[PDB]
Symmetry: D2
């Protein structure tokens, strides 16, 4: 089969021909319909030799959607042909967190050598992929695969971050969304669908501010030095109930701290090495919690899919072939994809 693999350190990913795999007992083989490109796949290929621990070669792609091609022995709940989205953050399935579906917060996955597809196990950027267990498949029915693929991470991750403090986001509340990219443009829509929060979007790019308005933001503010005061102008000096920072650079976190409300929240979702919120007295309002969430839960993915199927999630995508995969990753580096890049095997 055809696939995109990261085959040497510091070199760009290449199109390859590898064995179509077979499912063993418990596993499921999917024909891939769509495979999302995430900014996190860049962090993975930018890792030095000493830091990279996902093994070589590695079939990329942790945002996966497909149709069931073959059942491994003993597997029930799925028939051949069912369209399914792949739950990425695989856990052990047995710990207290995993039993609540919160496999993203699995404590023992590291020690047992369970790694996500695209981040240690063969991923979705291939004609077929293996899924370890039936519990990591989420039905999508007649959902367009191209729009479903980003739901597995670009939808799931903001959905989770928002879900953690959803009780705070009642009528009267204000949610700030920093970074209207893959994640943030879905985050805005989530906030609108599951809350009455006023949504303020923040980005450097005026085109991305326009995108924020397109997908439901009540206001849009240019990022940088002016941002915090412009957000306080909009909030009447009360601050933002929640900041969802999908950029996660120091300047965005600083902004988040300067605007968050007393008893509010900051969710640092974007990843910049070294960047951190400084949570201590006089550096942040009273009661303003900060967290770095990770991916999301099984029940949350199903909820994201239910939003997509209800028409509440317009996911802006561009389609690529497997051959155009390498090129698409380069496009993702330059920031020229207006939403999410998706690969469709022909």
């Amino acid at each position: 089969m055809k696939a995109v693999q990261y085959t040497e350190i510091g070199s760009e990913p290449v199109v390859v021909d590898i064995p179509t795999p077979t499912p063993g007992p418990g596993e499921i083989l999917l024909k891939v319909t769509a495979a999302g490109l995430c900014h996190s796949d860049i962090h993975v290929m930018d890792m030095p030799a000493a830091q990279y621990a996902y093994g070589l070669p590695l079939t990329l792609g942790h945002e996966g959607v497909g149709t069931v091609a073959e059942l491994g022995e003993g597997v029930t709940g799925f028939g051949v042909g069912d369209a399914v989205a792949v739950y990425g953050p695989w856990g052990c399935g047995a710990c207290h967190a995993c039993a609540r579906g919160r496999e993203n917060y699995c404590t023992r996955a590291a020690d047992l050598g369970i790694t996500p597809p695209g981040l240690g196990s063969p991923g979705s950027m291939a004609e077929y992929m293996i899924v370890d267990s039936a519990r990591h498949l989420v039905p999508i029915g007649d959902l367009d695969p191209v729009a479903a693929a980003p739901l597995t991470d670009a939808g799931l991750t903001p959905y989770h971050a928002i879900s953690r403090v959803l009780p705070l986001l009642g009528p009267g509340s204000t949610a700030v969304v920093i970074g209207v990219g893959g994640l943030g443009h879905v985050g805005i829509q989530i906030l609108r669908a599951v809350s009455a929060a006023r949504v303020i979007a923040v980005d450097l790019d005026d085109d991305r501010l326009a995108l924020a308005r397109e997908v439901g933001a009540d206001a849009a503010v240019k990022s940088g030095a002016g941002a915090a005061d412009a957000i306080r102008e909009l909030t009447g000096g009360q601050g933002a109930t929640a900041v969802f920072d999908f950029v996660g650079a120091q300047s965005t976190i600083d902004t988040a701290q300067q605007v968050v409300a007393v008893d509010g929240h900051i969710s640092v979702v974007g990843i910049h090495a070294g960047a951190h919120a400084k949570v201590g007295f006089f550096m942040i309002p009273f009661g303003a919690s900060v967290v770095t969430p990770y991916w999301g839960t099984r029940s949350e993915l199903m909820e994201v899919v239910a939003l997509a199927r209800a028409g509440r999630l317009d996911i802006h995508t561009e389609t690529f072939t497997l051959d155009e995969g390498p090129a698409a990753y380069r496009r993702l580096r330059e920031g020229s994809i207006r939403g999410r890049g998706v690969v469709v095997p022909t």
Copy 2:
């Protein structure tokens, strides 16, 4: 192997010799260390011919603990010898409720013919039992099997009922526990371990009131017409924040309605066919929710086990052999078991 089966309608269960089963892919074979007798096993054998739909024969026992004897193909997370408790209320594992571990509230288990062990599938009152999936096994480590078996239902069910309204049971709250039997005597202990609620126990039998005091009740009141006013004497006329009725007869539910607080809760856990709370204006206080909960969740079972391992759950038991099983069920009918009856295969 030796087992206790319900073989004919209306007739008492008998000791039998049946094939030691083999695990297929995904399944786990356990040697049984302990098997609990529940009052619900009586309701099952008292069902008429037309109502009984669990099939014949049926190996009894839905409270199960064991050691892993054999792994079916593809099963990981457990090695031979691990002591495990069996999660009873099996669900489909894939629905929104099941993905949160809430397999007790699985919507699709009925239509798929997934039934608990002891209530449609072979149960624990046998030398060995099959468990369908790894996710239905909960490690107990070095916990005494005899005291662990009741945790799977007698602990789990009250733990769940209490868990649903645990936010209400803060300092200042009062919890009434009606029926200090298998479930209720564990319920009292749970309330003490996980809340600061004042605990008032209610029972007909003065011996069971003594048992309530033994396990942590702050007061004990004889049941009947006088119970409500005696509970109001203790609560200063404010009412009970929560009533956990483990009897569930009409008179106990009536009592529960006459004592529950404004914005409080009634959990009808005991089962008497025809009995019901009457929830309508003027028949119950404002904001006083009522529910009939069912069994409990995967994460809840682990929590109950963690309580047992921490020394917070004194489970009063009497041990029986497989041969004494039939006799132990007659003893459970008369109400002569002070706590929970447990069968240990020799």
Copy 3:
């Protein structure tokens, strides 16, 4: 001043001339801008001699909005002219429930003789009204008084009922709203603003079903014997996560029980003497809680007002003068007001 009072038992309310009151220490005198007519004002006038305990005469109207006319001694937080909505369900202010703003669930208001305006204290259907305390005034800013008056009950009461089980109403959930009248048409809009629940409206009147679609319902079904099965057709046989029954007759409650989901909720908000949910095993799904909620909380009223100010609550009203008050109550009996009737003193 002019007002509408209930002056003798079983007789209709009449227009009267009574002293313009003065605020004592702590109190606030409002000039009334709008005064809502609620179906509950009918139940009050339908009470027999023996049951009626609100005193005579009684200035009607528990849905009140005004402008501050005079401050009683020691009162701060409000200046003359501020437009305010009146929080109706007055409590003692000191108990555990009142300290959380939950004055609707005040335990000690009954024994202290604190009664709502319009239901024991002088109400809003007058040129001026007294409010006991500053904590019972909610700023509305430039909100149209006519549309703000229903927020105090018609908005607040459904907002509360929904707030209690809001965690259940995620994407994928279904909320049924029975009775698309004053309350129910605001309930539908609340569900849309604060949740991603699919909203199914139920009413006897096809015109009210049209009204349900106008205000955002995803479907509408005629009430009666057919309702339950038509709701199950729409939910795929899964049932309704939540039923908010604003009629509260036995037939609507029966419907609610026949459609509610496993681990779902029924909120009996409408009031029919004798009507009740029958909550017991086999009469309702496992885990399906039932409650009769009452009015709502202080923080909830502010939230309802925040929804109105954000444009999320189209409140359908008809305006009346104080002279047309009596007539407007007769019009409310026949069910000819399409939404909520509001009295505006000139």
Copy 4:
């Protein structure tokens, strides 16, 4: 009347004779029965001239308990003689946070010049004190005033910090308490009363570790470089579900970050200027929230009082006279009070 006032900057507080105040409308005059000394009163007197904004003179003491001496006009809910504890963190009473009793998180108290007694308004370290409003009085009944005074802050503050993440602290959870002083020794007891968390105490002083065991800690560990690894030894390498750091120095926060669990919590309750948690990816586990909580809520104070009245809070105290006040503050500087210092006016 006699009182202790901070009268010049950088000078120690002195015993003075000032007018017995009179309550105006809404206010309540209390005869003080007990007045707690908090470490925060030291931070206040250590402030430079430029930073100190509480006005001079200032009657100290923000932990206050008394009996009602006189009612201001219009005040109801309290009769002369009622023993009451004073809710310290006064807010505006009208905002969304204040209406939920969360006056600690009042957004508008700063701009309105509402300041706590002992931190801007006359405090409790005097024969009498004024309380602005009835809502800031909490009945204590026959509770010993000396043991009730610390409940208003030393009890309330840890109760709040714990209350925020109480859902995390189920059976199986571990709570670390760093600093077994005034606050921390009450925090340990709270954790035991309202949760099944395993409690690990951390302190520099072996005497304070002994105190931790006296009041219910399951283990005790010497603070410093070794602390984190010793906590991980106890938790099986899983980490602590929650860290409540009542010291709040950088080294304790660093420790808290090195031991907190994935999806856990750090509550930085102690105050060291400049100290902060560094919440960013790779510097703290996934999902581990951090917050600096402030004081606590009205309903929480009542809950703390209910714990004291139930016998669940052994508050270690030493009594002082008003004359010994100055000396008692010097004793608090050196750290020679084993628990909380309380002043009783003679």
